[PDB]
Design a binder for this molecule. Structure first.
Ligand code: LFX
Lengths: 578, 155, 578, 572
């Protein structure tokens, strides 16, 4: 196991290339002068997420490795966009596998999936994250935020725009340093000394609805609730969890590099015991995964597959264990939106815990046989890569070494994949590891029409970005905890391309201008996940050697096939082939 | 001139014995560097009194000005070199010389609160109603600086 | 002893809750990925200060712990407010006690307490800071700052607000990068190369005084000295010191964890010798605390106590050593505004130095007996904790486990104290370690009236904050050293509630609007210091066992009455109880 | 050899005092709580560059020091100006050695040093930094930067200022997050989910040239190329590297502690041998450093061009009269030691194998003696081919002007004892003429001209401004806005730059500013946090060093009040 350090940033509402060229490349260009560095890979997906992974030689002091990487990241922190820094860039040194999974359900059905997710993040996640030996904690859900769901019809009715909503929230949901009376240095002999308390951060949906946006000239008030629905809601709605079909949430805990698995797992149970007596009624802790006893089932769909389509594949997987393998399976913890290879709408993962070793006599009831039948049952699922494993091949990287561009690296990958198909004697199931380009909406802002109308570019980009992608504004206090405040359009008005024309921006002269008046759009394709290897654009390709022939022969054939690709395309071996 | 450059750097550094041999060897008394500063300029700027005296005896232009119109009397009045201001005025320096900003040595002395120099300048006929490019006299400088001692000298 | 790391941040003019809800919680929520962390505690005070103390397991490398905490906070820096960042945060490994104290007095009397403090900060602190093994340097005083003491009556006469003052100071106290003439790339044939110098930072009160705020319509000009008094003064006026009853400043020297005690000390003494030749006339270095021979005296008053009352307790303590133990006490260095625990307008400390051991003969004159007699003499000072000690109960934390709030946690704390008072056969001196709530001045900005008059909220909050709390604008150069510029109201106009109405803010139409038009105020009770333990709101409770019973029974009892506390109130042991 | 740590920062367009009082001091004030620190010294120079060097006790872990130093610096990053944070503040162990210096030229002469440097940055530097056993790598130049060379005459013609050009670039060279169609949470049953793509980074000079600055009230449009010249250039032009008279770039490669030198040297040459098939036509790799150097330093105020003519005469001398011995002459215009600038330079000479250098006249000593004697007669330029360390401290806030007078008092007293001391001289630079411009606030406010508009107009045009990033052939690179050289050379060019007031009228710089000549330091030194001036020297023949040091201590004991001293370097 080679020690690895991972950098993870987030950019809400950002596409893969926007994330790549404002966050990923900036961080990568400063990742030199780091000792015992073997290679470095990164993913920038349309989730608004970047995950740079830095792998080191065996024996490298993971503590020191983290400091060096973190220390080089500081060179790029001021260069990153403000919206990225506000999410909190993280560097962590952990294994990529899960040590265990802590599940949380509500036996009384008193709490929705969202409610359970927020309680775990607000009352449970931090104490587990600070526990020694815990490298990374993945929440299966998202902490609540103050969600402002804007209505563009009502916003246009009062000559308002998401910019005005954002400005009002920063002004009225503020924490003010107001000073004192009788503060030092005082007039000699002062007796009264009291702190001055001015605006405090709002704490409820009722308070956020009270936020005064404007006073009409006739005297009536237009509040935030008059142009928006205000509710507690998750920071994002991309990770849902189920335990035996019932609503649940949990934390995926990976072990820190070099820590003890038994001692850290025991320290986590001790910390969970400190919070159980103060749970709300109905809440309960369950342990669906503990590291034979267990295995996982990875579900990966094509790019562009929604959370709806992924839930049905997960439903078939959970149905298989609950019906056909019910004599051996105790629980199934299904997670939609989070997967083995990361996080995305088109991925999923099922944690399966078998019943006791004693009540599964016979070899066909053992872990390999159960996973063996499971994958065979999942063989014929359409448009889905569904396999189960307990936990030969090669790891191939196709690099754009002459700045050819993403589209030409795709063709160079297809030409290599086609030539690998004509050699079944040597190469078996050569396929890419990433995602395929999907349709995307390309909108063009006419600078001349914007300037001719008096509509500023910042007003345009803020309106479009906040309504259609969501904008993190500031913080608020929810039951004594600091949480985020997000501003976004109500789902109703950000679903179809015609909804773009329903969004208005106020010009300098005061007239509302519809988004259709200064923009144009067309369909095009673009990557939902851009890969990079050692700083340059890459496309990971994986396969295994044919029956009986060693890996060095398959690698030698792959090297020969790859040298016939167009000029500027190179290659390198990573992971298990390094 | 090669000698003129050695004289400028010697006048800049206050080397009076090197300046004397350079004068006896025929160096240009009025050699100017790139900014337009003569040996009298730098000796007046860095407060080398006898270098100012030796230069004037050997025919130094007392009223030479640089690329921005500043005379050696300007620099001497600006940096509190009282004795150098007197010998310059005695050798015929223009007391009312203005640079490209219309700024006079009286302005420079008033700006830095060089009161001893202000009296010597007005003794030699300095126009106290002299305005710069912004219309500010030495009296306006005293009010803005809050220097009441100067504000009563000018009255 | 378990190594501990403390984080220090400050927020000028901010109250306890503002500080906690904007700084403390944000830092605490990012203290994950730290190895070997036992527990975490924090304080957020009405001085505008946070101190988060992270205690690590025994045998932990304090260097690694500090590095890991330093790096985590670096990532959380963009999540903190700009005002807290401009103050600079500190992460320090060190013990709680001082290694030595370097006092500085002025025999001539040409330098007051304020000037002595500025000299030690501007000419001694930084060099002592870089010395071998000195971890924490505490200045008993404050470095000078360019103090702008605004007058609200003059500002209203010229239609100006503190916003205009802060804007003009940033514009006219600037260090401008203006490039070069004949710089690269240059046109060929260029013979001149010279740096362009635009505006340089100001160096004197005279320069700040002639900062032009605005010119009137008749030609007359409004300078900064026409609306304010421009003087040199301390960044804060919280801490002042005295050596044998005469004006003094000094430096509190803490040993960095793991450093040698003596060889450090000699290095401080070595660097001090390099400074003495260039002291002004009258300045002299005295050594009031050198670690038998010395002891300390703690003075703690309840919250809501001013420096005047604290100074009264200090004089009584100083007068005791200088009169009734003059045969034993060489000198007394007393500080007000700084106690052993931390900072506070209600706290103080006195470093007592004895005469040579040989000159005090007998048991009656050694540090043990002298501290016993002193504590006995100070025990009847009313409304003050005064103890004397050289260099065994329990340490209890009451935890808010279910988002109850500060007020509900206070009632639960009082409930536990009342029940513990009914067992004098078991626990005695059961007391909270923190502070009680004090009257504070709640002011509400009416948003509707502010918008009807056309008055910006940020103009209102800046006018209120900068005047009554102070505002760090930018930096200036004082005798070749970078120091701060502070904007604040003159004492006169920020002492009693009626002065709130004396402050005017300019509306969009140029009209001056008094604070009384759009505000309303009331007295209420809030906390001056908010405690947290392991990320949750907490209240430290101290106590000990009754005569002749072991703390185990004592501890066991405390656990039992904590069980009868209201729903959502937890508990935890810390300190030497852990 | 005592370990050391170097903090390097950059403030583009800043004068020496500007960098010291906004960067150097703030970092020095935060160097507290660092273990095993012997002393600290720093430079702040003409070019907006500071290098704070903290040297540590012998036996101190250089890695622990580097981490301890950078942690305290990073926590002080919010206290530095935004322009300094953008350029990156590096903290690298000054464990100097340079395993080898690799040069890159092109035989066809079809590439500028800017063109070559960009290739090395994009195609070589990273793959070299990844080869077995390499440490830090410094490139001789920079990658491409989108250079906007403004013209103030056309800018004024359309009532535009550099502020408008910077505003336009940030608006029209932006990578904006725009969200999704049918994104979570959706209306249940939604089928369409596509990412919204709005503005992307510009990628070419053509796309920057079509940035819309404004449209007149008649139909005409004015674009960025209408008021500026667009080109792919370098980020700074303070260095001009040459190899045998040809434009050059390359890498300086240091070895990572614990690795082997012969190993890594062969691993680098093998990694370079693989890249040659991918080189454009004519790109060759040289190894410019049986070697020696030649220093070039011109008077104060000299230009980069005048330093080049002297460096060309030096390169010519070695390739002509020493053609039997000299193999290569790598000339660096703008870099020397004790100070970088337009009036300094250095030349690195590589000679043929000693096995083919028969005769004592062909040994390096006889080559430098001959070179130094021929360079003796170079007009108005010092050119040499090829003790104790004293620091005078400002101990009572006296100032730079007084600390110079105290230095001259000690230097004069030291020349009074040539029997014990010889070659007592300052190590730093002398005060040079500088162009002080004074903004008149009253006139600016009377005309309605914003101070920020003024200082940005002046600074961006005359010093350059790093606006934002762009994508050049798939790589993130910088965008710089600056005046075309023709309009930022001489004081009369100031009057050509116009700022726009609130009422809309264009106000020239001459209307609200005044200018004078004065003297200031192009390189301010500091020792242990206080202003300093380094003084070198040596004992006279027949005298021990400690004999000379005590006399210096005696002479320093009579300097004006508030002036102290310390021993550093090899004298510590
Ligand atoms: C930063 C300095 C470091 O020293 C340099 C060299 N060395 C001289 C011989 N040894 C002392 C080894 C280091 C060198 F050969 C070339 C260059 C060079 O081209 C260069 C540049 O910016 O273009 C800058 N530098 C160079």
């Amino acid at each position: 196991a080679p020690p690895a350090v991972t950098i993870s940033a987030s950019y809400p509402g950002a596409d893969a290339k926007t994330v790549q060229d404002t966050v990923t490349q900036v961080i990568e260009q400063n990742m030199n002068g780091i000792d015992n560095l073997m290679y470095m890979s990164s993913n920038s997906d349309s989730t608004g997420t970047v995950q740079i992974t830095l792998t080191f030689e065996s024996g490298t002091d993971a503590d020191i490795a983290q400091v060096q990487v973190q220390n080089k990241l500081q060179l790029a922190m001021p260069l990153l966009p403000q919206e990225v820094q506000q999410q909190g860039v993280s560097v962590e040194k952990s294994s990529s596998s899960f040590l265990m999974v802590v599940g949380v359900i509500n036996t009384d059905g008193t709490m929705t999936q969202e409610d359970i997710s927020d309680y775990v993040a607000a009352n449970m996640k931090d104490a587990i994250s600070r526990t020694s030996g815990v490298g990374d904690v993945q929440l299966f859900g998202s902490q609540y935020a103050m969600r402002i769901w804007m209505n563009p019809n009502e916003l246009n009715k009062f000559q308002l725009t998401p910019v005005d909503v954002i400005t009002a929230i920063k002004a009225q949901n503020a924490q003010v340093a107001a000073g004192q009376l009788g503060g030092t240095p005082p007039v000699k002999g002062q007796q009264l000394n009291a702190s001055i308390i001015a605006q405090t951060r709002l704490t409820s949906t009722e308070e956020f609805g009270k936020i005064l946006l404007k006073v009409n000239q006739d005297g009536s008030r237009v509040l935030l609730r008059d142009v928006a629905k205000i509710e507690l809601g998750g920071e994002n709605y991309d990770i849902i969890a189920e335990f035996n079909g019932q609503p649940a949430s949990g934390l995926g805990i990976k072990l820190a590099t070099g820590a003890n698995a038994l001692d850290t797992a025991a320290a986590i149970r001790a910390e969970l015991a400190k919070m159980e007596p103060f749970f709300p009624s109905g809440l309960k802790i369950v342990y669906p995964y503990d590291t034979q006893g267990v295995f996982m089932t990875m579900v990966q769909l094509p790019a562009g597959a929604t959370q709806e389509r992924t839930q049905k594949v997960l439903n078939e997987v959970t149905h298989y264990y609950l019906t056909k393998e019910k004599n051996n399976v105790e629980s199934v913890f299904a997670v939609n939106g989070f997967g083995f290879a990361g996080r995305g709408q088109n991925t999923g993962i099922a944690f399966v815990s078998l019943k006791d070793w004693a009540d599964r006599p016979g070899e066909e009831n053992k872990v390999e046989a159960i996973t063996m039948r499971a994958t065979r049952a999942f063989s014929q699922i359409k448009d889905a890569m569904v396999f189960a494993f307990n936990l030969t091949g090669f790891d191939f990287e196709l690099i754009d070494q002459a700045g050819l561009g993403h589209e030409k690296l795709t063709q160079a990958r297809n030409q290599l994949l086609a030539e690998a198909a004509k050699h079944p004697d040597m190469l078996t199931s050569v396929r890419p590891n990433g995602l395929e380009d999907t349709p995307q909406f390309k909108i063009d802002i006419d600078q001349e029409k914007a300037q001719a109308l008096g509509v500023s570019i910042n007003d345009i980009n803020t309106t479009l970005g906040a309504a259609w992608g969501g904008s993190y504004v500031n913080d608020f206090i929810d039951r004594g905890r600091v949480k985020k405040v997000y501003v976004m359009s109500e789902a109703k008005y950000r679903m179809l391309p015609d909804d773009i024309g329903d969004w208005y921006v106020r010009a300098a002269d005061g007239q509302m201008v519809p988004f259709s008046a200064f923009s144009s759009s067309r369909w095009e394709y673009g990557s939902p996940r851009l890969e990079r290897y050692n700083g340059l654009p890459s496309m990971e390709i994986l396969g295994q050697a044919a029956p009986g022939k060693s890996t060095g022969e398959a690698m030698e054939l792959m090297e020969q096939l790859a040298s016939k690709l167009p000029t500027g395309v190179g290659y390198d071996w990573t992971g298990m082939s390094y | 001139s090669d000698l003129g450059k050695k004289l400028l750097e010697a006048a800049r550094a206050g080397r009076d014995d090197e300046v004397r041999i350079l004068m006896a060897n025929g160096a240009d008394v009025n050699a100017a560097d790139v900014v337009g500063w003569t040996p009298l300029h730098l000796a007046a700027y860095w407060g080398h009194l006898e270098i100012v005296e030796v230069l004037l005896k050997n025919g130094a232009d007392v009223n030479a000005y640089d690329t921005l119109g500043s005379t050696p009397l300007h620099l001497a009045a600006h940096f509190g070199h009282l004795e150098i201001v007197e010998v310059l005025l005695k050798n015929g320096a223009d007391v009312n010389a203005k640079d490209d900003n219309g700024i006079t040595p009286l302005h420079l002395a008033a700006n830095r609160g060089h009161l001893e120099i202000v009296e010597v300048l007005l003794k030699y006929g300095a126009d106290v109603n002299a305005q710069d490019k912004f219309g500010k006299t030495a009296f306006d400088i005293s009010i803005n600086n809050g220097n009441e001692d100067l504000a009563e000298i000018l009255q």
